[PDB]
Amino acid sequence: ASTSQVRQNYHQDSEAAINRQINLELYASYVYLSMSYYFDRDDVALKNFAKYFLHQSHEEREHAEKLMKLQNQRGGRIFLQDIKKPDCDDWESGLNAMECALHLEKNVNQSLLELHKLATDKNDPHLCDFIETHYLNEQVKAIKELGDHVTNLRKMGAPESGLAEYLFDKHTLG
Amino acid sequence: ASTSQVRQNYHQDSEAAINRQINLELYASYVYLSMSYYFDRDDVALKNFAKYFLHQSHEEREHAEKLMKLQNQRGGRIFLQDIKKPDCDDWESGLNAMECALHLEKNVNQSLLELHKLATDKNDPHLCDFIETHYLNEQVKAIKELGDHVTNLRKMGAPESGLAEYLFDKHTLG
Amino acid sequence: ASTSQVRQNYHQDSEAAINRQINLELYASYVYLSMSYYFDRDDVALKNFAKYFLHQSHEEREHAEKLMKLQNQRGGRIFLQDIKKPDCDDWESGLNAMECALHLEKNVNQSLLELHKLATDKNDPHLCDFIETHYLNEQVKAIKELGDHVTNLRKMGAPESGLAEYLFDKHTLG
Amino acid sequence: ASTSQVRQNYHQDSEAAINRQINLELYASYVYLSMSYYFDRDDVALKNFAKYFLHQSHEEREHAEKLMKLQNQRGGRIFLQDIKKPDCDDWESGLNAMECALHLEKNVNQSLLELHKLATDKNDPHLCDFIETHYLNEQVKAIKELGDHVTNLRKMGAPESGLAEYLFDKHTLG
Amino acid sequence: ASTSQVRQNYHQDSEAAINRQINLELYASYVYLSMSYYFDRDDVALKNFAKYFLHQSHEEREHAEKLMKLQNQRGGRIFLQDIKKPDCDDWESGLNAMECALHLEKNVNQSLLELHKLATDKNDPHLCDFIETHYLNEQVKAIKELGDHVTNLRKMGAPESGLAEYLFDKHTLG
Amino acid sequence: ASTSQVRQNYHQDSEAAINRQINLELYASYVYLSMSYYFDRDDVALKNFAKYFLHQSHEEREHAEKLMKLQNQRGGRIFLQDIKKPDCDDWESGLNAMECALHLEKNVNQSLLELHKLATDKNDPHLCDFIETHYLNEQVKAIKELGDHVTNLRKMGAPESGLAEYLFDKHTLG
Numbered sequence A, B, C, D, E, F: 001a002s003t004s005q006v007r008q009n010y011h012q013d014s015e016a017a018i019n020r021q022i023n024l025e026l027y028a029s030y031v032y033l034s035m036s037y038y039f040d041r042d043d044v045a046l047k048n049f050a051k052y053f054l055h056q057s058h059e060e061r062e063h064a065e066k067l068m069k070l071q072n073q074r075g076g077r078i079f080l081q082d083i084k085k086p087d088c089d090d091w092e093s094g095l096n097a098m099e100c101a102l103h104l105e106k107n108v109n110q111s112l113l114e115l116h117k118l119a120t121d122k123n124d125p126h127l128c129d130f131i132e133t134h135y136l137n138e139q140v141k142a143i144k145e146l147g148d149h150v151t152n153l154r155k156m157g158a159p160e161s162g163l164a165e166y167l168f169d170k171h172t173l174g
């Protein structure tokens, strides 16, 4: 119960929202992990898709860690939840994985936007700045990159052209 | 259904057991993550406990990844499950965290030993070698290190001596 | 007849099996040699297929040499046999060569697995360790790589697309 | 009585066997020590035989130390015994010393093989791996080297040719 | 049937003769391989004989490869045959191995001379130049070196003097 | 029986005394070896005590070797005896180990002093100089260091303070 000695201008609702966001970032890490190893299957075998999604997975773990650090910086208390498995076991194709990643990042961005709204409603400028500085532009860039990737794959003839996915793997992700 | 072109001498039971082990390693990663940020709380404030457990968390993620790679190398199919949250939100003390980590690593080791027994019963020497080479000695070393740590903390007067935990933090984990 | 001064715990059946395995490795070297120069024909002209299979040929000669060294280390006696010519003179296509290499490596792996079973039945842990350390994972990696290659070529449109085989030659084997 | 906190899957019989093996390695160290200084006598005066056996003596002390470390890693308890003096005070000749070293290393290897059998019967894969990784191939190489040395000395005309032992000292051990 | 686009002034008899010569070079590689590991036996133990013959074995594999490349350069088609095992399993002595190698190289040289005669009869100056440039002087040098070696071993008292073979191993092959 | 060609002014009693001293130095090496691994136990876990005593163990082996060399330099003949196991299996504490080491080094010093008395009574100045140069001051320094260590541990509150032994381990032995 008793307060943290550091706590100031940090609403309990913001504290809870940061714990939800921690879960979401870990969930995103897990989705990209799954995607990565899909492309490492002997019957998929797109090694640069695999590295690309692994890198993205590790990023998301870093995003979670920074929110954990924030929780403590502000005197909130971290409460972890189960990290749900991804929706898919088999991601179908390079294009479909990229489409799923785009939708994931748009979902994560919507959560961060709700979090910023809350921080604004509770007049927490430090939390607003945090989210702006470390998260919002990183989402806009990720979203733009994924859209670019989907566009290229589509134009190249994916998913039906295995050639298209192979060449994208070498030229864009390589 | 249809076979993987790479698959040879890889029993379905071993395939399932590797998927269980993947979950366990990710679970271990999550426990150490939680422990790490506990020591980063302003009311705990043992920064080298925090770094030590974070490093251990990242290790475990690497151990999971290597099993995922193995699954694919052998032509098995990765099936992920929810990563359960840790048993504890509050780890009490440096000593109690170390005790919990020891029990975690002994549990992980017991799983790997059951996995090796299975691999032996199914006459899978490649899988036996894998487990021996990449996992079993790494467990024995982790277990020994954690026991050493618990011993020192106990001898120093933890958990009642906050001095003991502070000095261990600086001299052993620092 | 009279024993080797070094010989210990080395069954005559293991000695014979190692001589068979020596022949098999040299045979594998010969198959890859043949494949290599097929891709060097003026009417095939895929120079990176050619280098890839030449490298694999030299590897296999090294694998044979290490078994010869082992035979002597254990006090067995090397008995060489004719190295049979490969099954094919003309390997048809990049894809078909890769398919044949996959089947070759799976055959070599099955032989090594039978050899390990024998070594296990004769309670020869040094020989078990030898095979595990120097051979079994090297087979699993070769098999996985070849499967990956076959998958890519298939997805790209080989063997009918001469473009697919040309581009694979440059991007994967180059 | 009470258990070690680290102990897992480590049979008391294996614990005792490791203590016996520790004694044997120290015993081997002592035999090579004695051999070394024999060749340093003014009436023997083969300085490279002396260095060769001293190096081998120090190796064996390292092999003992690694088993001591293992005992502790696994939660067993080290119990030392007297290190018996070697069988011989006077080793007769370079050839006879080499012959005695060959028989010593074959004895040490037989002990390690019995130890591996025990570890296998008690389903201790970590201990099996330990012995395989750190000991069994090191014995096979030592045995092969000693056999090679005995062969050369014999072919050269030792022990009757003092010239043979002198020249072996310079060309093989030098 | 249909011609190679590159083929010019390349008689079918020369094409067949190059395929025979390819087999012979691989056969020579195999003989030297066998010789090499004979000297690696614990009861022979002449390590520089072993390295010398291994080097010669690898050379011969290179000589085969260059003929394979030639076949393709000229638009002929490679047809491989079984590589026969060597005549001997046990090479008796350093001197006898050297004598056998001399006879092998003289046989290989006689084949190359017949090949040059054919190339001359078919007015193939490119093939004549090939053989002259890459093979004939390399044979004359190998033959001279082997004769020199046999002479020295004979003068030193081989094969009865095990000392002679030991010292030759160190001073000439070392 | 017959004399060594090198022997001069070297009494048989001195020869025997050097053989006794060789045994004592090896015995000291063994005591420190045992002490070392005691501190490596998971329930003791003082790693710098362990390194300190291991270093001391290796020193003593060097002291033995130098006496063996001396025996031969003077034309005496080395006669080895069993190296007795240490008095203790369990050394109780850092302080008690240090106390036992102090008593060991004082015993070794008393032996060397008796040896010097003998060398003096037999008018062997070379042996007197040997002992003075290589041994006596090395004992006085070891004794002083061990006394210093015991003093510090005692003042710090050992053996009851596990904190004291931990901090000594880091600051003095570290």
Ligand SMILES: [Cl-]
Pocket (backbone or CB within 6 Å): A007, A008, A009, A010, A011
């Ligand atoms: Cl607040």
Ligand SMILES: [Cl-]
Pocket (backbone or CB within 6 Å): A010, A011, A012, A013
């Ligand atoms: Cl609030």
Ligand SMILES: [Cl-]
Pocket (backbone or CB within 6 Å): A080, A081, A082, B085
């Ligand atoms: Cl939950």
Ligand SMILES: [Cl-]
Pocket (backbone or CB within 6 Å): A137, A141
């Ligand atoms: Cl930007």
Ligand SMILES: [Cl-]
Pocket (backbone or CB within 6 Å): A167, C167
């Ligand atoms: Cl391209």
Ligand SMILES: [Cl-]
Pocket (backbone or CB within 6 Å): B007, B008, B009, B010, B011
């Ligand atoms: Cl299977």
Ligand SMILES: [Cl-]
Pocket (backbone or CB within 6 Å): B010, B011, B012, B013
């Ligand atoms: Cl199955």
Ligand SMILES: [Cl-]
Pocket (backbone or CB within 6 Å): A085, B080, B081, B082
């Ligand atoms: Cl689940």
Ligand SMILES: [Cl-]
Pocket (backbone or CB within 6 Å): B137, B141
């Ligand atoms: Cl280790």
Ligand SMILES: [Cl-]
Pocket (backbone or CB within 6 Å): B167, F167
């Ligand atoms: Cl301090």
Ligand SMILES: [Cl-]
Pocket (backbone or CB within 6 Å): none
């Ligand atoms: Cl300090």
Ligand SMILES: [Cl-]
Pocket (backbone or CB within 6 Å): C007, C008, C009, C010, C011
């Ligand atoms: Cl045997």
Ligand SMILES: [Cl-]
Pocket (backbone or CB within 6 Å): C010, C011, C012, C013
């Ligand atoms: Cl047998």
Ligand SMILES: [Cl-]
Pocket (backbone or CB within 6 Å): C080, C081, C082, E085
């Ligand atoms: Cl045959």
Ligand SMILES: [Cl-]
Pocket (backbone or CB within 6 Å): C137, C141
């Ligand atoms: Cl691997």
Ligand SMILES: [Cl-]
Pocket (backbone or CB within 6 Å): D007, D008, D009, D010, D011
């Ligand atoms: Cl146990």
